[PDB]
Nucleic acid binder design. Structure first.
Lengths: 219, 366, 927, 366
DNA sequence: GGAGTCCTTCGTCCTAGTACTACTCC
DNA sequence: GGAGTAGTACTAGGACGAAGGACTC
């Protein structure tokens, strides 16, 4: 059973640690089992522990005051862990989400190892870039490429993108499979340098040696 | 140099020879034909640089031997254009070909025979006759599965396999693969030769379906095909046809029978609302029932419910509707038998009446 | 035996460009660190690092062995290209190889690069020994087909033309079909009695270099690493394998290793480098010497009548010049230069006869009165105490370089003259390069790794502008580099890659920088590079290397601005018949014009050459230069050192009497230094002042004086100590005080560190004064010319207009009908836009428009225009800009009716064009 | 909305209304279908703002009124693909229209009728009916002279001149003009109207050759055409057309008749050796004799000599052969008559036996 | 030390070929 | 109604032109 997710946070840091001083605000995750969308969503909103960044606000909307009463990552720690444990996590811009994930994990102080030890972390962007080199292979790009609509959807925020990623994911990994097509003692001659050739050689080495102060052939 | 032929002896040869031409033939002499007159034998030539086509017409009226090379399309149309029973008189005047018939006169540029490219003589290894009919059915029934332009350029073509008393053809895309095996009625040595797509198109075109047998000769790196008055020669592409024995489904355990026409009609209708590029329609089979459904990007749904002979366990499989309609078009029969494995394996399809052909279209798993 | 059991005979540097990875020196140093005595470098169709190869051979005690690998065309394998390795055994082979390379380029080629016919080995034959090309050779490919008859046909050619000099190439690198080829090659070798040689087909030092080379290839070819279509012909085993590694690979065929030692002994080519093969020429039945003496005495007579047009004064002032002339003439003749002088003076004269004002650069050549006498230079050196010994020093037995340049516009005309002169193939242009510097390598690796434009450019714009910039330097200078490295996986992968490729050779080199002259065919000395059609030959050795191999060069310098002056002069001299004014000779101008100095003191020196900087205009304002000497000084003044050491303020203050002038210092001065230091108000500013002070104060020769300035540049311990003594007793011998002489020497040496070359500054400052006189003496064509020159720059065009506006210039928008090529002045219409002034439009379309206007009358309307001129010439895009610019305003009063009518009319017109061409009488009336 | 209709009523209309609709229109609703139920009537409307198509089919089966707009192409493909004799029940359900037939069920996205541009009411000005067969003749015999994409927007269409009881047709590109006028037996107003190229293409297209009267109503700026329950409205195109009396050759003095098929087969043949860009032939005509010559730059040559009925002086004139081949093809008659003026002017060419139609083709400069 | 000569790569536009659809022929 | 040929639409490839980073003394 495989898990499609992209986790939206209190903006990004472009510089230094993209996770430093940031925490999770929304989890939008869609469940895909046997390449069918079950609709068993874990879609929750979290404690910001900080200000939502002006840029992040404009991206998909979400107000700081809305995520204040909502529970913290500690109240859904085991809940979210068992939801993704032993399953496929392919995410867009993996550096961002993984950074946050492991960050929250260390904040629990239960010595819980990083998500990548019990869950399969794969970036989808890397795979798309590999498949379509020189094309924009962002999620929205691939969405439009495989004719998936992310504009006329009532679902706003993380759940929008999770849905889209699931469709993109299935499209790339369903494009079509393959007809695995088919996959002593002897003579020969020793050519001795003639006396003329030997003399040219000697003269050439003389030059090397007289001008440079060594001859490795005679060392 | 002169010859006189009747338009009607030249018409079908000329049409046939003009088929391979359109390539914007860059080496200008390729836009022309090689005429060889020697004896009372006029030889006709069509070449696309990769293959060669020879026809003879006998000359009953006065002639003088020699050779030249005249522009193909234009000469074909002139002759096709002339009335039935027209007296066509050709004659070389120095550097031009003169064509007279009646009161009309034409003076054509001429390029010398010695500039026209010749593909080499080779020696025969396998030789056989068969009815044209058999070769016609063979190609027509399966040609649709060949690649157009692939990295595996050798799949732009078809496996020819002779062995014992069997002719066996198969062709593939890398997506779907079409197979046919036929008895040929003569003991045949084992040989494999791979002919380019343009080759098979031209071969298709030379079949009038009539009773003149087709007789082909196969050399080391070439093939020659004789039907009646025409002789075809192409060279072969290097080798490595992938192993068809590997792709065969290993005991497809479910048996599924349904009327070819009904089935094809329902696919055509359902296809209108599939993915434009990949033609994805989805199949649900259960005991005595088939539900077809497909998705289109705009959330629209086309759907068929149908009465389907099927014994076996329930499973789902969807794949490209264009490829399956292509096989239903090659299946010139009322009923289809499908033998299955699973949603992630190659498939077998046969006509419930002929095991002669074998088909595979792959699934996509959505 | 002696020590060596094996040498590598198949290895490329990155200068093969199709492949190779390590630079030349590093490759040689690895070979030597491995304790092998010889090594073949066989780059693809070039010997670009041969100078470096031979210098590294000498240095390390290593014998260089000369070769190359190839792409061939034989009739036996048809269109398929196969590989060949060619060894030159001697100088016969060297010349054959030089000719072979030239022949490949002369034939032309495709994307695959230049190719040879196998039968060119008939002519290009003697003293050469051959390897098959391995699996990818003629014979290898035929062997892999398993066509024994084809193989036999192929070898037969080498049995005819290369008996005992044709080898079986042996390769065990574990790559596809090498074992099948090897099996067939061993059969052939025994069947035919043949000798074999083993190589390692080396492309890199260590197996970890493979990744970098993969990416190197991909960058050149323009393909991405993970592209399935990308050729994967190479393996990580293509590294510098040791003696022992190769000994174990081929422990079944000992003779294969031993035959490398044998071949290496037979391969001995001498190409002598670092010593001159000078060019030259005769004239009449006269000596080259005497021809120069003649043309210079009589050239001096013209200049003397220009300088002193009173013949009484010319006679009294003359002796000085004749003595200078003969003093220079003696050094020139006794060193044996006069062929050189003659070529260049002929060249300068011919470009005057034809419509070519001559390119400004002279190096420090303004120090030569002979150059001036011969019309090579433009300035009186005796007026400004200009010194020949800065430019050619007689006390030094070395390179003359007279470093001659010319204007761009007329390069083909000069290439042509020098082909008429020497033979087109006996003359060559010289390569300049591409290597992959910091910005390029980032952008190129980024695209290969599949990034959008925006991503990668966000990185490369953080790499500083500077010429010598490296990634290591970039990361220390710019804190954002370390930051994005640690914060971005894509940037990390990219810089890790860019670190391995930093500085690497990128491809074929752009054109020349300057053009070289041999005394015979250029191919007598090197093989060249030529363009896609095998034309426009350029030398495979670069500027420093090609001249170190002995041949004299001729530079491009496109300070083009000559073109401006030229055009403005043509336009001024048309105003001759309009009011009977004689045509103007920029060389004939007075040096003291007040309008010129008024405008300069107002700092309005935009487009006045070298004084266009805002900062430099700030300096001019403070400095208030009121004589020509001050104009020569401006380039020497605008430098960070002199300004920020108080020297600029001293100079400005001593100029206006606000600080007393000393010769040179308040305490440490002497009046005999006054003639030397006069022009600079007692400040030691120039290299040539240093030299004059050693001559006058301390009795140095001018050449010994130049040797002291050179020694002050180096600052070495022993060096100075000796000259410091000569300088002491030389002053003593002239009765000048020792302590004063030495204390002035300390000041000279302080300021020698900043000291700029006055002759080099003056040659260029002459051109600034020309642009100054021209601007002021008529701010009226000049402006047009300024704009013409920098037609490309929108920013500058805008700047120039703002300059016009401020001036009382200004200024009309274009007209398609009335306009000339570029800006033109009718008397009343101060200015009309040129056509070329329009931004987007190409040169072809501008000419098209005007051409049509010429044949027809002035364009009546929109429609009229379209009909006369097809879409080929003027695209719709083009047309749109024209309307929007307002060149059309006269016709289309409404900037917008005509915009709507465009597309339809264009198509209409053509439908008309085709109707004309064909065919065909039409019907009805009209619209 | 809910109704059920008979495949057979709906099929021909579906083909009529879909066939001109461009694959990808500029304004999406142009690809969708207006469906209107009122009374026992389904009205289907396909338009492109230039022309407008309405079809009606009577509803004998249970229904519920309403309107919608669905994708034209796909709807037509669906209906074409339906099984023989299919009675299809369709229903509006929320945002989808559901299409049923037998066990097949389909579901299409929907745009409302209200969004669709209702083009304008106008009052009829001139009214008449005529046999379908006359109209089809009039149009077929003449349509080949129109331009493609002309700046003189009034040539991209066909000029009708109506006077008394006659209608006359004309279309032209400035090199040839094509007329047919025939008596229709009704007193009309005096008025001329130019209908757009695509309008006339489609009107011709729907002219099932049969019994049905064709009735048309023209307004001042639109025209409407009724055949049965297909009801057509288009705007008209404006410009100030040139005078056909200046294009008609004034008094062609020299006369030439010849057998049309012989003439035509010979020109088809001379056409082959004409330059591809210019399509040029030269005509040499002399007393009772006719000679065609052409050439190309390649210096290939054709000559025809034929005997023709000609009284008059010799004459030399060249044409674009495409222009005359196009009239000879449209002229479906046995004997032709040429009446010639001079080398710089119009030539008259016509069926020797009819004069309903008129052709002038302009000469060339070679 | 600055600027010009240098090409090459990126973006846009036009031209040519191929495929599909529709009309005319069989 | 189906097959063959023409016409139209869409895709693919190549050339042109404006931009940029670089290596020359």
């Amino acid at each position: 059973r495989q898990i499609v997710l992209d986790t939206e946070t209190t903006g990004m840091n472009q510089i230094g640690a993209h996770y430093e001083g940031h925490k999770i605000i929304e989890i939008g995750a869609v469940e895909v089992v046997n390449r069918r969308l079950t609709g068993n969503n874990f879609h929750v909103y979290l404690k910001p522990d900080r200000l939502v960044d002006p840029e992040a606000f404009g991206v998909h909307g979400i107000a700081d005051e809305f995520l204040l009463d909502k529970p913290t990552f500690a109240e859904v720690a085991d809940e979210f862990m068992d939801y993704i444990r032993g399953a496929e996590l392919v995410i867009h811009n993996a550096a961002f989400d993984i950074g946050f994930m492991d960050y929250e994990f260390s904040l629990l102080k239960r010595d819980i190892p990083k998500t990548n030890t019990f869950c399969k972390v794969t970036d989808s962007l890397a795979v798309a870039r590999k498949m379509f080199p020189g094309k924009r292979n962002s999620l929205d790009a691939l969405c439009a490429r495989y004719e998936i609509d992310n504009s006329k959807r009532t679902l706003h925020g993380a759940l929008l993108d999770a849905q889209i990623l699931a469709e993109v994911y299935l499209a790339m990994t369903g494009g079509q499979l393959s007809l695995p097509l088919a996959m002593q003692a002897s003579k020969l001659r020793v050519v001795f340098a003639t006396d003329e050739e030997i003399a040219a050689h000697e003269a050439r080495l003389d030059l090397v040696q007289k001008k440079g102060g060594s001859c490795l052939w005679r060392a | 140099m002169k010859f006189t032929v009747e338009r009607e002896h030249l018409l079908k040869p000329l049409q046939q020879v003009s088929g391979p031409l359109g390539g914007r033939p860059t080496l200008p002499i390729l836009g022309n034909l090689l005429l060889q007159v020697a004896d009372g034998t006029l030889s006709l030539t069509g070449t696309d640089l990769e293959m060669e086509m020879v026809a003879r017409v006998a000359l009953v009226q006065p002639h003088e031997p020699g050779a030249t090379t005249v522009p193909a399309r234009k000469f074909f149309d002139i002759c096709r254009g002339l009335p039935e029973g027209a007296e066509i008189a050709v004659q070389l005047e120095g550097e031009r070909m003169l064509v007279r018939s009646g009161r009309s006169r034409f003076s054509l540029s001429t390029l010398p025979a010695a500039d026209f490219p010749n593909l080499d003589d080779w020696q025969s290894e396998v030789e056989f006759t068969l009815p044209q009919a058999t070769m016609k059915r063979l190609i027509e029934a399966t040609q649709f599965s060949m690649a157009h332009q692939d990295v595996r350029y050798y799949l732009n073509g078809m496996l020819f396999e002779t062995e014992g008393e069997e002719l066996r053809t198969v062709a593939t895309d890398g997506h779907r693969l079409a197979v046919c095996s036929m008895p040929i009625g003569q003991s045949l040595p084992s040989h494999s030769v791979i002919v380019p797509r343009k080759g098979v198109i031209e071969l298709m075109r030379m079949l009038d379906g009539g009773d003149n047998p087709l007789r082909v000769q196969i050399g080391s790196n070439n093939i020659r095909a004789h039907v009646g008055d025409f002789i075809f020669t192409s060279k072969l592409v290097d080798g490595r046809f992938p192993d068809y024995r590997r792709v065969l489904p290993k005991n497809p355990d479910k048996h599924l029978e349904a009327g070819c026409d009904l089935l094809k009609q329902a696919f055509a209708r359902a296809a209108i609302l599939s993915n434009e590029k990949f033609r994805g329609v989805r199949l649900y089979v259960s005991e005595n029932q088939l539900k077809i459904t497909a998705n289109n990007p705009e959330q629209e749904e086309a759907e068929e419910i149908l009465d389907v002979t099927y014994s076996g366990a329930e499973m789902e499989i969807g794949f490209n509707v264009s490829y399956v309609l292509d096989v239903l078009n090659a299946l010139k029969c009322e009923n289809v038998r499908m033998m299955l494995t699973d949603s992630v394996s190659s498939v077998q399809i046969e006509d419930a009446a002929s095991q002669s052909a074998a088909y595979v279209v792959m699934p996509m798993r959505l | 035996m002696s020590e060596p059991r094996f040498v590598h005979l198949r290895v490329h540097s990155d200068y093969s460009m199709i492949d190779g990875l390590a630079k030349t020196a590093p490759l040689v140093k690895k070979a030597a660190a491995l304790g092998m005595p010889a090594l073949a470098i066989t780059d693809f169709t070039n010997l670009c690092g041969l100078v470096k190869f031979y210098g590294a051979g000498h240095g390390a005690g290593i014998k260089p062995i000369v070769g190359a690998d190839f792409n061939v065309q034989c009739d036996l394998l048809g269109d398929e290209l196969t590989h060949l390795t060619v060894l030159a055994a001697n100088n016969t082979g060297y010349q054959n190889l030089t000719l072979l390379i030239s022949k490949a380029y002369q034939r032309g080629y495709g994307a695959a690069g230049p190719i040879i016919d196998r039968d060119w080995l008939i002519e290009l034959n003697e003293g050469l020994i051959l390897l098959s090309g391995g699996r990818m050779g003629d014979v290898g490919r035929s062997l892999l087909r398993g066509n024994s008859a084809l193989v036999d046909e192929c070898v037969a050619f080498y049995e005819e033309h290369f008996p005992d000099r044709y080898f079986l190439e042996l390769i065990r690198t574990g790559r596809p079909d090498e074992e099948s080829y090897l099996h067939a090659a061993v059969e052939l070798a025994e069947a035919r009695g043949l000798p074999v040689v083993a190589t390692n087909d080396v492309r890199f030092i260590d197996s970890s270099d493979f990744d970098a080379h993969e990416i190197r290839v991909a960058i050149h070819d323009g393909f991405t690493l993970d592209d399935p279509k990308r050729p994967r012909n190479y393996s990580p085993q293509q590294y510098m394998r040791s003696e022992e590694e190769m000994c174990e690979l081929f422990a079944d065929i000992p003779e294969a290793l031993a035959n490398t030692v044998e071949i290496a002994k037979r391969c001995n080519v001498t190409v002598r480098l670092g010593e001159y093969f000078l060019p030259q020429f005769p004239t009449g039945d006269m000596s080259t010497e005497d021809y120069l003496v003649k043309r210079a005495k009589e050239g001096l007579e013209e200049r003397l009548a220009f300088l002193f047009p009173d013949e009484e004064e010319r006679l009294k002032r003359r002796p000085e010049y004749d003595e200078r002339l003969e003093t220079e003439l003696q050094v020139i003749n006794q060193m044996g230069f006069p062929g050189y002088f003659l070529i260049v003076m002929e060249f300068i004269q011919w470009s005057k006869d034809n419509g070519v004002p001559v390119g400004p650069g002279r190096g420090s050549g303004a120090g030569s009165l002979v150059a001036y006498a011969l019309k090579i230079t433009d300035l009186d050196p005796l007026e400004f105490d200009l010194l020949f010994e800065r430019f050619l020093n007689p006390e030094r037995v070395s390179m003359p370089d007279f470093d001659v340049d010319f204007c761009m516009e007329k390069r083909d005309q000069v290439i042509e003259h020098v082909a008429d002169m020497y033979g087109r193939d006996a003359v060559s242009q010289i390569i300049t390069f591409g290597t992959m510097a910091a910005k390029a390598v980032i952008r190129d690796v980024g695209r290969v790794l599949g990034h959008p434009y925006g991503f990668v450019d966000r990185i490369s714009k953080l790499i500083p502008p500077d010429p010598g910039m490296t990634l290591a330097k970039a990361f220390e200078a710019e804190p954002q580099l370390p930051e994005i490295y640690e914060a971005d996986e894509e940037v990390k992968a990219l810089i890790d890659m860019a670190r391995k490729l930093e500085g690497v050779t990128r491809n074929a080199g752009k054109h020349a920088g300057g053009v070289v002259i041999a005394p015979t065919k250029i191919t007598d000395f090197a093989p060249l590079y030529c363009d896609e059609e095998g034309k426009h030959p350029v030398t495979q050795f670069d500027k420093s290397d090609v001249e170190y191999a002995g041949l004299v060069k001729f530079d491009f310098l496109g300070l083009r601005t000559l073109t401006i002056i030229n055009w403005a002069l043509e336009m001024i001299n048309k105003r001759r018949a309009k009011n009977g004014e004689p045509p103007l000779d920029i060389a004939a101008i007075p040096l003291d014009d007040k309008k010129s100095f008024d405008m300069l003191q107002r700092s309005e020196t935009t487009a006045v050459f070298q004084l266009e900087s805002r900062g430099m205009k700030d300096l001019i304002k403070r400095l208030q230069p009121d004589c020509f000497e001050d104009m020569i000084a401006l380039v020497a003044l605008f430098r960070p050192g002199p300004l920020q050491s108080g020297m600029v303020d001293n100079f400005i203050d001593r100029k206006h009497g606000r600080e007393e002038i000393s010769y040179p210092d308040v305490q440490w001065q002497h009046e005999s230094l006054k003639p030397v230091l006069e022009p600079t108000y007692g400040i030691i500013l120039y290299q040539e002042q240093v030299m004059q002070i050693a001559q006058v104060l301390s009795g140095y020769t001018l050449g010994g004086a130049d040797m002291l300035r050179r020694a002050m540049g180096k600052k070495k311990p022993e060096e100075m100590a000796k000259q410091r003594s000569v300088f002491a007793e030389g002053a003593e011998k002239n009765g000048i005080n020792a302590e004063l002489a030495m204390k002035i020497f300390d000041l000279v040496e302080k300021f020698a560190g900043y000291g700029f070359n006055k002759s080099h500054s003056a040659a260029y400052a002459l051109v600034s004064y020309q642009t100054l006189w021209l601007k002021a003496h008529y701010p009226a064509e000049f402006m047009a010319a300024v704009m013409t020159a920098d037609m490309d720059n929108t920013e500058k065009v805008v700047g120039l207009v703002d300059e016009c506006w401020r001036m009382g210039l200004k200024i009309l928008p274009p007209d398609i009908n009335s306009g000339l090529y570029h800006f033109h002045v009718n008397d009343d219409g101060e200015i009309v836009y040129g056509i070329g002034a329009i931004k987007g439009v190409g040169e072809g379309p501008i000419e098209a428009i005007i051409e049509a206007r010429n044949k027809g009358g002035y364009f009546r309307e929109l429609f009229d225009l379209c009909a006369r001129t097809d879409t080929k010439k003027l695209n719709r895009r083009v047309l749109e800009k024209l309307i929007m610019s307002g060149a059309f305003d006269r016709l289309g009063p409404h900037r917008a009716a005509l915009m709507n009518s465009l597309g339809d009319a264009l198509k209409a017109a053509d439908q008309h064009a085709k109707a004309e061409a064909i065919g065909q009488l039409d019907l009805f009336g009209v619209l």
